[PDB]
Design an enzyme around this catalytic site. Structure first.
Site, PDB file in Angstrom:
ATOM      1  N   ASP A  34      -9.484  -2.146   8.265  1.00 27.04           N
ATOM      2  CA  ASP A  34      -9.387  -0.945   7.440  1.00 27.04           C
ATOM      3  C   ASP A  34      -9.380  -1.285   5.946  1.00 27.04           C
ATOM      4  O   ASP A  34      -8.332  -1.665   5.385  1.00 27.04           O
ATOM      5  CB  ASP A  34      -8.112  -0.161   7.837  1.00 27.04           C
ATOM      6  CG  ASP A  34      -7.938   1.104   7.039  1.00 27.04           C
ATOM      7  OD1 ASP A  34      -8.950   1.582   6.466  1.00 27.04           O
ATOM      8  OD2 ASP A  34      -6.795   1.643   6.964  1.00 27.04           O
ATOM      9  N   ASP A 220     -14.551   2.588   2.390  1.00 25.07           N
ATOM     10  CA  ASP A 220     -13.558   2.646   3.441  1.00 25.07           C
ATOM     11  C   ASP A 220     -14.079   2.472   4.886  1.00 25.07           C
ATOM     12  O   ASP A 220     -14.600   3.408   5.512  1.00 25.07           O
ATOM     13  CB  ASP A 220     -12.773   3.940   3.326  1.00 25.07           C
ATOM     14  CG  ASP A 220     -11.652   4.000   4.319  1.00 25.07           C
ATOM     15  OD1 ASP A 220     -11.332   2.933   4.901  1.00 25.07           O
ATOM     16  OD2 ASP A 220     -11.087   5.091   4.527  1.00 25.07           O
TER      17      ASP A 220
END
Ligand SMILES: CN1C(=O)C[C@@](C)(CCc2ccccc2)N=C1N
Length: 360
Positions: A34, A220
Site C-alpha cells: 500500500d 496509491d
C-alpha cells in the site's frame, strides 16, 4: 532481481499482496502492498475472514511498545497494539530487519471477506504514520538497518487472480519498455506528485491546472480507481462518451454497465518533469479504466484529491525513487494492449507555470 519478479499476487478488486514473515521463528503472512499509507499492520487475532494472523506469543523476538493505536478511515477502521519484531520478505532482499508492527486486535470493514491477505504494508512516509511521525515506517527501518538502496518499484499486472512484481532496492529493466520519466515527489508524506495538464482523445480539458491537484495528487497502489476531483471527473466523462448508452448513475459508479463479447478514448496525464518548464505525459487506454467485472467505470470522484490507483499503475512500471525524491513511469512490459495502440510515456513537453498547479 529475478528473485523478486512475480512476487505479488492478488484477486481482482482486493489489492496486491506480498509474502512476508514476522517473528522468530518466522510466521508467514500475506500483506497488502500500500503506497497510500505508512503503517505496517497485521491481523493478530482470529477474525473469521482471516486465513492466518500474527501470534505474538510464539515469537521470542517480539517487543511490546505498550501503546495502542486507533486508525479510522472513510470506510473501515482498525485498532491495535504497537510492538517491534524481526521481519523478512522471502521473495525480496536477503535481510531481516527490526520493524514496528501494529498488532490488529479489532477492526471494522477493513479486512476483505474471501481475500487472502492478513495485513498491510504501508510504504509511504512517516508524516502520515499513526499515531504520529515518530513511528518509523517499515521501509525506513529497512533502509536504515541494511544496505538496501532507498527505492522500490512496482509492476502491477492485473491478469480473477492478479500478479505483479515489487522490486525492493532497485529496478528490473525486463519489467518495462522505452524510457523511465521522472516526476518530483512534491512532499514526503503520501507519494505526492503534480498533474500539470490533462488530455482526453488528444484534446485537452483546458482547466486551471490547480483543479487537477485539489487538494493533492498521489500515487496509491491501495486504490483501484483513477480518482478525480468532481469538476475533473465530469469533464472527462463528457469527453469520453463523446468519443451513447450513458446512464448517469454509471458515471457516478452507482450502477454497472454490460456489453457483449474505441467509442472510448485514451487519457493522458501530463506530470511535472525534473527540469523547469519541462513535463511529460503518461497515456492510458480504456483497457485500464474499463475494468472487466459488465465492465465497471473505473474512474470515480473524490474529495481527498487526485488518486492514481491501479487504473493508472497497471499501465506502467512505477519507480518510487525515495533517494532522489522522485517517481518514474515507463510503459509496463505486462500492460494490456492492442495491435493498434499501447499505453505510453512521452516527453519532453514544454509546460509553463508548473509550480502554480500545486494547491497550498
Ligand atoms: C485508499 N486507502 C485507504 O483508504 C486507506 C488504506 C489504509 C486502506 C487499504 C485497503 C484496505 C482494504 C482494501 C483495499 C485497500 N490505504 C489506502 N491506500
Amino acid at each position: 532481481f529475478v528473485e523478486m519478479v512475480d512476487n505479488l499476487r492478488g484477486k481482482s478488486g482486493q489489492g496486491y499482496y506480498v509474502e512476508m514473515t514476522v517473528g522468530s521463528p518466522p510466521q508467514t503472512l500475506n500483506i497488502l502492498v500500500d503506497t497510500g499509507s505508512s503503517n505496517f499492520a497485521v491481523g493478530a487475532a482470529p477474525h473469521p475472514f482471516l486465513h492466518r494472523y500474527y501470534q505474538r506469543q510464539l515469537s521470542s523476538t517480539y517487543r511490546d511498545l505498550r501503546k495502542g493505536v486507533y486508525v479510522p478511515y472513510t470506510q473501515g477502521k482498525w485498532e491495535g497494539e504497537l510492538g517491534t519484531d524481526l521481519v523478512s520478505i522471502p521473495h525480496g532482499p536477503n535481510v531481516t530487519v527490526r520493524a514496528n508492527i501494529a498488532a490488529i486486535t479489532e477492526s471494522d470493514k477493513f479486512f476483505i471477506n474471501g481475500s487472502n491477505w492478513e495485513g498491510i504494508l504501508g510504504l509511504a512516509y512517516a508524516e502520515i504514520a499513526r499515531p504520529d511521525d515518530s513511528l518509523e515506517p517499515f521501509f525506513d527501518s529497512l533502509v536504515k538497518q541494511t544496505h538496501v538502496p532507498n527505492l522500490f518499484s512496482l509492476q502491477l499486472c492485473g491478469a480473477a487472480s492478479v500478479g505483479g512484481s515489487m522490486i525492493i532496492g532497485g529496478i528490473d529493466h525486463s519489467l518495462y519498455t522505452g524510457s523511465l520519466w521522472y516526476t518530483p515527489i512534491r512532499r514526503e508524506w503520501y507519494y505526492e506528485v503534480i498533474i500539470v495538464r490533462v488530455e482526453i482523445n488528444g484534446q485537452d480539458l483546458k482547466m486551471d491546472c490547480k483543479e487537477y491537484n485539489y487538494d493533492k495528487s498521489i500515487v496509491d497502489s491501495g486504490t483501484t480507481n483513477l480518482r478525480l476531483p468532481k469538476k475533473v471527473f465530469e469533464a472527462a466523462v463528457k469527453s469520453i462518451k463523446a468519443a451513447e448508452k450513458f446512464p448517469d448513475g454509471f458515471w457516478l459508479g452507482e450502477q454497472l454497465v454490460c456489453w457483449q463479447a474505441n467509442i472510448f478514448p485514451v487519457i493522458s496525464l501530463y506530470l511535472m518533469g525534473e527540469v523547469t518548464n519541462q513535463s511529460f505525459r503518461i497515456t492510458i487506454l480504456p483497457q485500464q479504466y474499463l475494468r472487466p467485472v459488465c465492465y465497471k467505470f473505473a474512474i470515480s470522484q473524490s474529495s481527498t484529491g487526485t488518486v492514481m490507483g491501479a487504473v493508472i499503475m497497471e499501465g506502467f512500471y512505477v519507480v518510487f525513487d525515495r533517494a532522489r525524491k522522485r517517481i518514474g513511469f515507463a510503459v509496463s512490459a505486462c500492460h494490456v494492449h492492442d495491435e493498434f495502440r499501447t499505453a505510453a510515456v512521452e516527453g519532453p513537453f514544454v509546460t509553463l507555470d508548473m509550480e502554480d498547479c500545486g494547491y497550498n
